[PDB]
Write a protein that binds this ligand. Structure first.
Ligand code: FOL
Ligand code: FOL
Lengths: 159, 159
């Protein structure tokens, strides 16, 4: 099963030119815990930004480009992407945008981080129809000494 | 010779209850670079924000309470602290708020990082009579893929 995971700001903003202005270790931590030991699919840019494969996980890159790093697996198609995940219980899509778009329709579960932040982004998580999904988990947290903003943990299952 | 280093948001904001909303890897670099191979004087909470002893530097913590970590050197005054530095060309003072207050008077130089952001502050960089200093270096930068905000670095010497 495919699952998407993402951090979202107000308006479903997920990306921009510049570095996101916020400090969410707790989020990083959530992400971690939810991806660890699972295959992860991501696009080129994401891969770039990250700059090293994520330890503990089968890193799969979705590009058209040929890719240098042999530490990961590159693929050119959604089908391939999936193919490369083998026999697993959950496949985790980590974006970006188009990636999310592509996988959304195959996606059965979503892990979303809702951040109380307002920014001018260039990228947005694809709109999804609420009526189609069920919140089976949600967990609010205020900003604290380590998290610059308040944010909330949500997991939706496809209805 | 004494110097102070700090990064100030608008209005001398240097701290908040919660996490600063910005991510400035470049300022840290600047910080590292200007503090390396010199004694760094800090106050207890910074030290606790830092969590470990800064490599390449000699860590002096000014406080009322008694040590907790054999690694660094604890002092109770500004004279001791200054003492603990020994004969060295420049002593770097690093915060927080109180500390900087107590050293401001003896400083001959300021290493400032003016951050482009409005935040409701809890601590502030000591006020300093701009007439009393000469800017001797300044360097602007724009926010980018790695730094959420724009900032300018500056060095001021006591006139
Ligand atoms: N919820 C969510 N939060 C995110 O930050 C996020 N980021 C991406 C893509 N960007 C990144 C960037 C960095 C790392 C990363 O460094 N991950 C480390 C966490 C390291 C830590 O705890 O410092 C990992 O080992 O998973 C992952 C994804 C995708 N989905 C997200 N989804
Ligand atoms: N310009 C400036 N920026 C700061 O962030 C700052 N911080 C303090 C006290 N706060 C801190 C907290 C953590 C680290 C720290 O990890 N420093 C590393 C750099 C690490 C890196 O390159 O990630 C060091 O080794 O110097 C430093 C200062 C004092 N003056 C400052 N001054």
């Amino acid at each position: 099963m495919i699952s998407l995971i993402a951090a979202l700001a107000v308006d479903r903003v997920i990306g921009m030119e510049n570095a996101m202005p916020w400090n969410l270790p707790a989020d990083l931590a959530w992400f971690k815990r939810n991806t660890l030991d699972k295959p992860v699919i991501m696009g080129r840019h994401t891969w770039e930004s990250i700059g090293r494969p994520l330890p503990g996980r089968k890193n799969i890159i979705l590009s058209s480009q040929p890719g240098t790093d042999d530490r990961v697996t590159w693929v050119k198609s959604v089908d391939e992407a999936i193919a490369a995940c083998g026999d697993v219980p959950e496949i985790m899509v980590i974006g970006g945008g188009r990636v999310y778009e592509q996988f959304l329709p195959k996606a059965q579960k979503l892990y979303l981080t809702h951040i109380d932040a307002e920014v001018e982004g260039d990228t947005h998580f694809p709109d999804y129809e609420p009526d189609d999904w069920e919140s089976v988990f949600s967990e609010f947290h205020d900003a604290d000494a380590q998290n610059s903003h308040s944010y909330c943990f949500e997991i939706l299952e496809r209805r």
